[PDB]
Amino acid sequence: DFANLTPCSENPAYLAKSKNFLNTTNDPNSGKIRAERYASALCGPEGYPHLIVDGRFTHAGDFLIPSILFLYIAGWIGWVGRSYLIEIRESKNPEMQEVVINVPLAIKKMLGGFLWPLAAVGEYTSGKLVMKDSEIPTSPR
């Protein structure tokens, strides 16, 4: 599999470059630990590491782990914002709290987003997530 590419520790361009990888931070070992981390990847003929997003489990660090972490965080952000918008709708001036943000209820929801997909499927199953087409405002069709 992946015959056009090579493992990095065999690709001699990768060794010739990773002998001289520049240290990003003040740690002198930064280029060396970069080389040690990138040697386990799949490098091209030019020596730079290439990532596979097909869904290979051994390439889970290439796509799968950061994608599911981004999905978890994006669901946290979206559910916190959605629950804040649902809660502040029943107020005297819901536009005021949208532009001068009420801190404590926002903080209460911010430390409340660690169970978001269960809340999402519960709100979907209880009809609190999707409205009807007749209920929403529509342009002249």
Added chain:
Amino acid sequence: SNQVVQAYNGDPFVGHLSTPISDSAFTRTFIGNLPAYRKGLSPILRGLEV
């Protein structure tokens, strides 16, 4: 008075001004005696001189 800038032909609401460039006596006697404006000329003589 001493004001050399006046209304064009005495009408202040016509969009022009009586200026020493536009309506001096030299301007009228020069432009009006150019062949395109010279009085009594046949148009072939005007065109010929131009």
Added chain:
Amino acid sequence: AALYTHHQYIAGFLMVGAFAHGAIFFVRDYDPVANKDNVLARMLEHKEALISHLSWVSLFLGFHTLGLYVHND
């Protein structure tokens, strides 16, 4: 190079003209009574869904292509 570029430019012009003359059809030639409940009027019915989903996928593509290109640069 000249042939490929010429034909892709002509293709872009023709596709834009197709969508423009479809808009002209909707302005001048479309009968909402004769086309009631068929595919044309149904496309009119959920036009917000189509426009919003195209906008979402355009934002998706542009965001991530520009992010990867700028990260690489």
Added chain:
Amino acid sequence: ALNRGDKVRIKRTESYWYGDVGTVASVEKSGILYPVIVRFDRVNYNGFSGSASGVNTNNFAENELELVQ
């Protein structure tokens, strides 16, 4: 038929609030083509370019409103 305080849905097929819910403020007397005053929480587009708000009330007929209560 409708009275003040009810919530209704706009069915004019041309208004900004078609699909939005509005509240009945008052109903004018008979002989009036569009008697019922409907107020809305969301303003419309009305105003010169650069205006920060629009109008939030409109005049409708009885058949253009659907009672939702």
Added chain:
Amino acid sequence: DFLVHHAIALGLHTTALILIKGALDARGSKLMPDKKDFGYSFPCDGPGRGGTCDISAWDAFYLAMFWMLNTLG
């Protein structure tokens, strides 16, 4: 090739988005519901109702010309 293919995808999607929004709002929108009475090509509906420059479907053709040229480039 992969990055520029996703850029090409973005260009195709955005040009289609402009053209489809123009074709499906040619008859009317919430900002201008009697657009079919004004025709395919007209300048605007004035500065009223917030301002309505480039509201016709002709203007959406005109906007999509730029994105078509961008994708073809």
Added chain:
Amino acid sequence: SVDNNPVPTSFEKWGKPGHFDRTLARGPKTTTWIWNLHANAHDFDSQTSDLEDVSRKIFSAHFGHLAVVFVWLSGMYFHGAKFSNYEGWLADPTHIKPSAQVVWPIVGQGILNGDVGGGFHGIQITSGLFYLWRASGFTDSYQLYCTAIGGLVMAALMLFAGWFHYHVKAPKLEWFQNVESMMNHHLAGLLGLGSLGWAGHQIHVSMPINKLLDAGVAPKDIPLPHEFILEPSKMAELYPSFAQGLTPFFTLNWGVYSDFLTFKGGLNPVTGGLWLSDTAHHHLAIAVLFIIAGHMYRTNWGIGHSMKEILEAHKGPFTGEGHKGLYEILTTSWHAQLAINLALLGSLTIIVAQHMYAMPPYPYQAIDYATQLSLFTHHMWIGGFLIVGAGAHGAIFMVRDYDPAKNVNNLLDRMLRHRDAIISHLNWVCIFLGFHSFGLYIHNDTMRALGRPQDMFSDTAIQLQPIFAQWVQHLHTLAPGATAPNALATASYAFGGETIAVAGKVAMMPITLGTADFMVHHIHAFTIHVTALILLKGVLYARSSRLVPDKANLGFRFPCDGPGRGGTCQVSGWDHVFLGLFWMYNSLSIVIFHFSWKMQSDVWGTVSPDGSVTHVTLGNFAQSAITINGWLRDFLWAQAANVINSYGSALSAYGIMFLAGHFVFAFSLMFLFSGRGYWQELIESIVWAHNKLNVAPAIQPRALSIIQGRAVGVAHYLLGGIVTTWAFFLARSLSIG
């Protein structure tokens, strides 16, 4: 006449945005509210209708602006003392480049900490701070730290003064209207006494360490600036005129002081800067003339002038009632004063840019070509922006503060009465200039492309010699000794003379003027005339035209009066500002491109020991700058190789901004080519999608207004283009060497 506690100081109104505008204080309904808020903050004439409170707000805002400028200057002195190499550069000027910004090593950005000299890693600063600090006599990091601390204290003083003059003790209107005293206090005060104090500083402090550093004394061996004033024997040791004291000053015998106050001219041939004795004598003469000027007008003692009487006496047979009424305009309208001040200050900043390169006043600034190019271009851009703002506030005065009953048959009324003649003749001039400069370039491109170089406009072909500028250059060359007998050298060697060759580099030579200079100067004349035409038509037609007779009722800032009358979009004065911004941008881009190419081609370079100079681009301006293709290939394409081959080096940030400006300019075209109806309908579709998942915001989202769309477009266009040119210019001139 000072009020006592007009406005209380409370923290409550900080938390309610939109307090200043009556419509904004109701709360947000559409997103335009937010965009209105920042748009309506500083329009003090619109919030309150009384001139008094507007003047109070302006005075306190001026103090706040001065505080901001002092914070910036304090930060500059702090970054020049802690995170700089002013120590090290000062002992060795021409081995070490100036660098006053140190960047943390993070995410690989420590590559930007480039080797500038003496074991330093930082960004090579091109603002010229080191050369001015050397010209002022700075020699230690502790004194720069003291200056930074003093700048922080003065910023706190400015903030306290603004708070005091708005909230506690605030002046009345006739304090502001007393402009007769204000001009005396600004001429004999600020400018005159400031230049007298700086001349005293020059003579006492800046001259000794400068002349000792030019002599060869190490900076540690020059002790400290105060011990000169502790012991006056050091001046008589160095300038032997300091023996008679202050006696020849008061006894009309000023020729005793002709040893530290001179009329040499030219440049110091150790540094390339101006002579410090020349600048001190200039500052002293400027001080005396400004003190004399600041006793013109009657203030409190019945002696002086009335500016009203002077204006009212100036009238002629052509101009009716003359300057009658201009005092009332300039004492009641802040906008009219802002217009004329912005015009003169922008012209002054442009004059500063043009005078600073040809007479470099700072040591080693001239041989730093990056610093010279940066300072010229920065001051040009500042001046052009201020001139556009002048046209803006002239139109704003015309819309808001003009009154026809109180201007009858004066100059301003006659301007409004013959604006058609003015604008039509300016239109004809602009077309004539565009043809007879740019079509000369087009002619040259076509004749070179057709293989007819003998038919071009060039020095080797049909010649366009700028003979008047050459004659004036000749008269400046024969000035010092014939028409300026006491002047030793010429005012600048750009007019004619010999080449100053500080280190291996060039500082100034005779800038010769041929056909290409003629062509590019008429291009400058054309572009300046078009920018002036746009802004002057915006001023003269801000109130009415034959198209829209009631334009003053629509205001200064409105998109249009509808699609009717053929179409009336961009009729407002604000839209004339919008268009003049692009045309000023075009004008100044060409001005700075002319400067960069001519300085690299016929001035800058490397001097041989025999006396020959190898220029940076080897004199290609005479043959390549006559075509558009030459500007494209030999100027843009050739010199952009430094900015695009910067990746992987310390100049790579200049690469990134070279991309980044290219983004923003193109991003601008989205706002510039489109209209808000499309964007509003698209927003309706996205709001329907938000309605489906109940994420509709309470503040309703709208498209930007037409004016705001134009503003975003012009802002992004100018930002992207200026960032692109900045990156290109800096990566070229940090690689010229």
Added chain:
Amino acid sequence: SHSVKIYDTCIGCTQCVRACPLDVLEMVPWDGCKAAQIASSPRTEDCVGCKRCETACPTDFLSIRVYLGAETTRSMGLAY
């Protein structure tokens, strides 16, 4: 000339007539609204098409509509 039409949602606020800078519109008596007046456009040959009347109209989906049509010297606002 341009066409100015007035539809039956007019509530007689007279704001379109006040906003019109070319004296196109009047208010005539009516019975369809509580104000008992409806806008009218007898002078559409003087209409320039500026749509100020549309901007002034407070009814949602405006009761006055201007349609730009045939272009004349008066309609293009020409002083020459």
Added chain:
Amino acid sequence: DGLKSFLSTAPVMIMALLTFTAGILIEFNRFYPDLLFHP
């Protein structure tokens, strides 16, 4: 109590959150740099 609501205005919260997230990212980079995948 108006300063508490002045901080509660939208630009102050969004800049505070941006500084917090940027500080987290910069600190995670300056502790553990050069991560393209999961080792």
Added chain:
Amino acid sequence: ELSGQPPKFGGSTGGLLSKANREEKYAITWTSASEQVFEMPTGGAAIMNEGENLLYLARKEQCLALGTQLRTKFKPKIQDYKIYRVYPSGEVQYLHPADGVFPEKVNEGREAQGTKTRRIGQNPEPVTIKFSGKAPYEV
């Protein structure tokens, strides 16, 4: 004929062009209680006489902008101005206010023109009126 003294004016370039003597011009007459300064709609300031004032302008919009200024920018509001259209044959046609009453106020005898008995949204489709030469709003 049209009567009134011309307001005293120095002259301007913004005034009448050849359209005035070729196609049409417009006239505005108003009575003034005193001599005060007004703003010309063609740029600049003019002085209106005491009594009758007759001003010639290029467009109807200029006359109506002047009339708006007369009604709104003077403490005694000049509310009696008449705007006429003047043809080069000499015929003067009275324009504004047409019935003697300003059009923002209702008057009997005014006929409803441009009024539609249908709503804005019940205009018929364009496809129903093809090859007829008439728009949806004209039917």
